[PDB]
Structure 1
């Protein structure tokens, strides 16, 4: 669920997920995908594409089990779909942390309506 996603992003990036990524670029947070503005935004593009494959569960509302042990995310979910959801989330948290070097506050509250049509997943 969004609960787990936000906890993973805070643990890896050190940033509040809604404030920093809830409206970042053309792909992070609310809305749909678009042409990424930078690397942080490409992370969220990949994340949303990763979510489209989850037909047997709900990425928004269904919670799953995971641990923050030794500064690393471990998915401890046995439900197959919720397991894929956890790995989708884990991937974006790690990806965003890796691109903290090029994170720019200008994209923080992006006007997502002017975003260009996204490429296919």
Structure 2
């Protein structure tokens, strides 16, 4: 669920508030359209498409589904007690948190005008 994804980000990018990732580029947060503006936006586009795929599983709601995971000693793991929806969303989230840790963050790309720039 979004609270757990927020905690995965806190566990992989400790030197930055998770809100930094909430409204970035064309895909991070609200946005879901146009040309991703940079590497971090590309992380967010793959994450958004990942959710869209998970949503094809009956009864699977990625923003709300609680899954089982651990974040300890620099390692993030999705655990084996997850059902098919929980495992998929857990993987979408984990994949995105690891992506965010490797991508450069460009202040200029925070809170861009999605209506003008993400067509």
Q: TM-score, normalised by structure 1?
A: 0.87
Write the distance in 1 (CA, Å) between the matches of 2:87 and 2:2: 14
Deviation at 1:108, TM superposition (A): 1.4
**What residue in structure 1 maps to residue 61 of structure 2?**
58
* Bigger strand share: 2
**What residue in structure 2 maps to residue 88 of structure 1?**
92
Contact map agreement 2:25 2:31 (CA 8 A) in 1: no
Contact map agreement 1:3 1:63 (CA 8 A) in 2: no
**What residue in structure 1 maps to residue 111 of structure 2?**
109
Contact map agreement 1:6 1:16 (CA 8 A) in 2: no
Q: TM-score, normalised by structure 2?
A: 0.88
Q: CA RMSD in A?
A: 1.3
Give ranges in structure 1 of 5+ residues lacking alignment: none
Alignment coverage as a number of residue pairs:
114
Write the distance in 2 (CA, Å) between the matches of 1:115 and 1:59: 27
Deviation at 1:31, TM superposition (A): 3.0
Give ranges in structure 2 of 5+ residues lacking alignment: none
Write the distance in 2 (CA, Å) between the matches of 1:110 and 1:87: 28
Matched ranges for 1:32-51 at <5 A: 32-51=32-51
Write the distance in 1 (CA, Å) between the matches of 2:87 and 2:35: 28
Contact map agreement 1:34 1:45 (CA 8 A) in 2: no
SS at match of 1:67: strand
- Give deviations 1:32-54, integer Å, cap 9, x for gaps: 23311110000000111111111
